[PDB]
């Protein structure tokens, strides 16, 4: 249908430009405000900006001075350019579409920013053997997120990934259980993808009793 | 609130009538712009709320506030909920309101604990791991247990979060030594939730 979806870095450090990308399909690009919204872990929605095809631009008043939005009408993309980031700007990063009269009415799916400075890492993984229920420990990762998914997605039937916790360490690990039936603990095979697109890590691992 | 002000909660039962006010100024909707109304559930991105032929939600406004009401609350019906309106071109959100349906059933919750991999003592470490899902009201008290003694030091747990079933779930992680590990006959990872324990062992 109309599909919105975001790209840009997962990490940037304080004082530097986050800038991030959403590439539009399924609609028309020159009827609509293309939109920018934030959310700050644990806090309510912000107003960045729109444009319009043919340039026209508003954007939030407390974000004078540092928003650039950029159009590729032969791409359908659009961007957003944040300079000077401090902490504050930690936050999902949506894109939309404002139908200009009508409301913010597709919404992507939203990226997560972590401006820090401190450095990424990719998780190390490790198997949690076995209804039996099997999983994946992925273990001392910075920043958020990682996906993961089971037999390259076509395992998703009583799939529970849960919540990372965010370690004393600085470092956040989680764990991703799928409840399976006993039968198949030996016929069938168990891979866990895990893919932290923060360092550009992907591990397989398959898991065994 | 943020430009826009909301209640930061509210509450009702199955089937009651629920109001959410958007309060906004001369600026923004009692100069004649239209309020939006978006439903945030847990973990997605807002929806927009339409209102045409919609039988149980509708809206007011009256100066410079307007209203959502909910007729016939349905436990689905939980999310955040988030008013918008113009100020010039510029569009302000509120700041959010939690809807709560009450007299939801308590549920208990299922806990899975697993012993540190072969793989992880190979590296020198060992995390044992305690998953708690599918509980309501959302508190938990986790506690460790080495043998029969409580263990402290090394314990990682996080806070309950809302689940799309409206439960939540929550992580407890151990971290020990290998040796710590080899010395014990069991570790226990205790979850009690509205005062009934739920206790789940494992053994070198």
């Known amino acids: 249908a109309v599909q919105l979806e975001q790209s840009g870095p997962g990490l940037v450090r304080p004082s530097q430009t986050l800038s991030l990308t959403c590439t539009v399909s399924?609609?028309?690009?020159?009827?609509?405000?293309w939109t920018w919204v934030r959310q700050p872990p644990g806090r309510g929605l912000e107003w960045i900006g729109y444009?319009?095809?043919?340039?026209?631009?508003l954007l939030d008043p407390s974000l004078r001075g540092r928003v650039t939005m950029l159009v590729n009408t032969s791409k359908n993309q659009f961007s957003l350019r944040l300079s000077s980031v401090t902490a504050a700007d930690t936050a999902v990063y949506y894109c939309?579409?404002?139908?200009?009269?009508?409301?913010?009415?597709?919404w992507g799916q939203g990226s997560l920013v972590t401006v820090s400075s401190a450095s990424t890492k990719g998780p190390s993984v490790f198997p949690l053997a076995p209804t039996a229920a099997l999983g994946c420990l992925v273990k001392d990762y910075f920043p958020e997120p990682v996906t993961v998914s089971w037999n390259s997605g076509a395992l998703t039937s009583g799939v529970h990934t849960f919540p990372a916790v965010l370690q004393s360490s600085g470092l956040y690990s989680l764990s991703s259980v799928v409840t399976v039936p006993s039968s198949s603990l030996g016929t069938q095979t168990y891979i866990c993808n895990v893919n932290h697109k923060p360092s550009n890590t992907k591990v397989d691992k398959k898991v065994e009793p | 609130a943020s430009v826009l002000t909301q209640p930061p909660s509210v509450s009702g039962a199955p089937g009651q009538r629920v109001t959410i006010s958007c309060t906004g100024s001369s600026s923004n909707i009692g100069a004649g712009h239209n309020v939006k109304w978006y439903q945030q559930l847990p973990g997605t991105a807002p929806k927009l709320l339409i209102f045409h032929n919609n039988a149980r939600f509708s809206v007011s406004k009256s100066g410079t506030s307007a209203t959502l009401a909910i007729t016939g609350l349905q436990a689905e019906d939980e999310a955040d909920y988030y008013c918008q309106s113009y100020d010039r071109s510029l569009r302000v959100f509120g700041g959010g309101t939690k809807l709560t349906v009450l007299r939801q059933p308590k549920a208990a919750p299922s806990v899975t604990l697993f012993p540190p991999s072969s793989e992880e003592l190979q590296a020198n470490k060992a995390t044992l791991v305690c998953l708690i899902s599918d509980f309501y009201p959302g508190a938990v008290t986790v506690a460790w247990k080495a043998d029969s003694s409580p263990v402290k030091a090394g314990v990682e747990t996080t806070t309950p979060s809302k689940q799309s079933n409206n439960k939540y779930a929550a992580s407890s992680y151990l971290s020990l030594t290998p040796e710590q590990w080899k010395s014990h006959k069991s570790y226990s990872c205790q979850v009690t939730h509205e005062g009934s324990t739920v206790e789940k062992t494992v053994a070198p």
């Open positions: 399924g609609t028309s690009f020159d009827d609509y405000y």
């Open positions: 444009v319009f095809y043919t340039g026209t631009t």
């Open positions: 939309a579409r404002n139908l200009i009269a009508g409301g913010i009415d597709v």
